[PDB]
Amino acid sequence: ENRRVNADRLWDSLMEMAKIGPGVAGGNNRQTLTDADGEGRRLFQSWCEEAGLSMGVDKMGTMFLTRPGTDPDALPVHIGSHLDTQPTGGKFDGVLGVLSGLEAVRTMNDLGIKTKHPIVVTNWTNEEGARFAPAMLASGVFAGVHTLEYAYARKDPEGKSFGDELKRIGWLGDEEVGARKMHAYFEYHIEQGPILEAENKQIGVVTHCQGGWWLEFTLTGREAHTGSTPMDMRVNAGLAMARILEMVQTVAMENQPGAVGGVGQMFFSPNSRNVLPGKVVFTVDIRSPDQAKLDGMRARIEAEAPKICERLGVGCSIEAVGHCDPVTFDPKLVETVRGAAEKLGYSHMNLVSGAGHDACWAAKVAPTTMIMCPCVGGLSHNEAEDISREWAAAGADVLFHAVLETAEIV
Amino acid sequence: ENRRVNADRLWDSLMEMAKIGPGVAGGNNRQTLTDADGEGRRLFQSWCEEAGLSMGVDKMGTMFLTRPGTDPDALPVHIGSHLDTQPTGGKFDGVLGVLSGLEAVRTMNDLGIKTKHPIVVTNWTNEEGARFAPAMLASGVFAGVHTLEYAYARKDPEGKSFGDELKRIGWLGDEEVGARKMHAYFEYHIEQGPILEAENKQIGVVTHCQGGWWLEFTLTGREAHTGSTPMDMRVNAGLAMARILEMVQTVAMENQPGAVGGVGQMFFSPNSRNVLPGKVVFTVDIRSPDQAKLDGMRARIEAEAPKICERLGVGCSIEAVGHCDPVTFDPKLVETVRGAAEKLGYSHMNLVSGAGHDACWAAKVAPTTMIMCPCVGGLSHNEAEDISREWAAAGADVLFHAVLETAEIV
Ligand SMILES: NC(=O)N[C@@H](Cc1ccc(O)cc1)C(=O)O
Ligand SMILES: NC(=O)N[C@@H](Cc1ccc(O)cc1)C(=O)O
Ligand SMILES: [Cl-]
Ligand SMILES: [Zn+2]
Ligand SMILES: [Zn+2]
Ligand SMILES: [Zn+2]
Ligand SMILES: [Zn+2]
């Protein structure tokens, strides 16, 4: 209640990691299994070892940095997030949670605090799902949602497989994925939504996570000349994609509040200015806090889209390339978080997470919750993503205390 | 009337060139200024020199192969097309006209025919405008529509410039672009439309070319998280693009008959599945045989599209990256072509060309017309583009006789 993390030390570690794999506007382009990700993992590794943590790496490249407890038989409390970013990443999505875990350890060392349960700072591979789909791939293997082989065979847009890239940057570890058992899992993360800033609250007590689908459409047209083909003879997969995006906007807007839909990825083949496309590939991202509502939006998109296509002579094929159902966080750990906020005198409210997180898969296999701090305009997945020294430190303080309650001081 | 070209020799030259830069389905991917194009140009060069033609090359890489006439004062009759293809090219778009020119020369040699006017077989650089926009770039320089510098600075999607690529494959010539004066220019080309096949006509007597615009849209959104951004806070340039494609389909359909509108090329940035795009870039291709109608479709697309975008918070920027006005071919050469068809006993009808061609720029600077043969289902810019030995030869015969009438036998 007096005991606080070092704000300047946390902040300084965030500005140092921001320099690894810079974007073009003061954010980060440090995507999974690139060289810059390798550099980021090594920097994090070295900081952690100077803090007395010992490293284990699983076959999905997930890094576990351990601070032993006083009971050698006791299961660990993990503090988790990701160091991998979007191509237009901010400095804080993922990174905040991992380096807050480090700061909590450093503070314990500064105060010579021992715990019953070990504490394990965790960096999951390919949270973002920008380079290889799905998102939360490593934590999904951990929870048994995906096989190792399935994960290894994911390809980026240049055709490189996840497995090979992991091996290339040198982070294929020896531990079986998901062989570690957790006593509890905590994730500190920026909100990525406008609510905490708009309501003037310092801490978000995360109760639930909204679920989502990634539906990948492959539409088949007929390559043909854009100048000499009569309109009544075109098989236009581009127009079909256009009508499908409009229909997604309608489904989302007919399902307010608590529903989003949209598309961020799109490919045309062969992508010539005077050739109607033979393939159009894109991903629809739909999400709701409410399972039945999410099921209903999916069924509907999947029924209406083939009819848009059939009206145009266009072939339509859909694959789920990502899926997380809504999650309810562990009520006991939710109280610990609220309690830590109150003990510390920090304004707080409950919150549903808008994004998915590795925490959502962690909750399959262990008591789990999350903590959020505010971010400016709820902007995230943009280089302009912004938090203050003061916001970051507040939530880290809450993380510190929640973890100590759960790991048990001696 | 007895004198016909060698159908097996023409056809065999088409099947030989088809083996250079193969596609993935028995067409061709032999785009401008690739190594495959270098190889195609060299094969054509060697066939022409075996036929006693002498070569000049301009600074745009256009190849002029000359057969002398007996009048020292007389300007040449050119036979023109292109050997460069789309990524999903057929074996016949462009190639038919260039190798028919060669076949006509070989037949003149076989019959020992001399002409008053010299004959110049012409292969123009970057007709297709698939790799570098605009289309008909070299012939455009020739007719004075584009500067040499502007042409050299065109970039492909990987950032290579036209100028450098021309130099690399070894086709930068020494002649000033457009220094040659032509007496007349003829282009034999497949129809790329269904009409000749459907009407059971062997020869298309081309009277006009429909004109067109390439309008390149750059839409500006805000990169944002596709799960955690509320719908009322998204600036969705993808949805804006979707509504613009639908508006184009409406403008085209409301301008029937004689209007086409469509999109073959599209880029999203940064093209991650969970990041709404910051940039969406695409090209709208609009065409009409009627100038006022084409003008009107452009004004309308250019007025309605910024309003679609402004309603979504999206910034809108439009640049013309290609333009040819409707062309009326030289009526005297049109009669020569009709006459050759009649002399030979080939069924014929008039046609407006759906595509643009180098012929359209040639017509700025010399009497010009085109000859078409049928193609199956009017399918073109597709590897499955199809003509028969019999169709190809008939139109070449008409080319031969039209050119002889115009160049004048001795
Ligand atoms: N904070 C963050 O990196 N989160 C990702 C993870 C995710 C993506 C798709 C999905 O279906 C479930 C989770 C995001 O929601 O974009
Ligand atoms: N041979 C061929 O396929 N021709 C091209 C040329 C063209 C392109 C754009 C334009 O505005 C005018 C002409 C096509 O029609 O796409
Ligand atoms: Cl090449
Ligand atoms: Zn995250
Ligand atoms: Zn993220
Ligand atoms: Zn052509
Ligand atoms: Zn073409």
Author numbering:
A (entry chain A), B (entry chain B): 6 to 415
The authors write:
As a model biocatalyst class, we selected carbamoylases, which promote the hydrolytic cleavage of N‐carbamoyl‐amino acids. Based on its reportedly moderate activity for N‐carbamoylated‐ l ‐tyrosine, we produced and purified SmLcar, a carbamoylase from Sinorhizobium meliloti strain CECT 4114. Using this artificial link between enzyme activity and bacterial proliferation, we evolved the carbamoylase SmLcar to accept carbamoylated m‐substituted tyrosine analogs.
Guided by the electron densities of unknown small molecules bound to the active sites of SmLcar and SmLcar_GC, we performed docking studies (YASARA) with the synthetic precursor, cam‐3iY, for both enzymes. Specifically, the critical Leu217Gly substitution identified in the first round enlarges the binding pocket and allows the aromatic side chain to flip by ≈90°. Lastly, position 329 is distal to Gly217 and the introduced cysteine in SmLcar_GC (or Tyr in SmLcar_GY) interacts with the substrate to likely further lock it in an active conformation. The Leu217Gly substitution again proved crucial and boosted the turnover frequency (=0.23±0.01 s−1) and catalytic efficiency (89.9±13.2 M−1 s−1) by more than three and four orders of magnitude, respectively. Unexpectedly, the Phe329Cys substitution resulted in significantly improved reactivity, as SmLcar_GC fully converted cam‐3iY under these conditions. In stark contrast, installing a cysteine at position 329 proved highly beneficial, boosting the turnover number (4.84±0.39 s−1) and the catalytic efficiency (849±127 M−1 s−1) by another order of magnitude. When compared to the parent carbamoylase, SmLcar_GC displays a ≈70 000 times higher k cat and a ≈170 000‐fold improvement of k cat/K M. Combined, these results attest that our strategy of linking unrelated enzymatic activities to bacterial proliferation presents an effective means to engineer weakly active biocatalysts that do not fulfill a metabolic role.
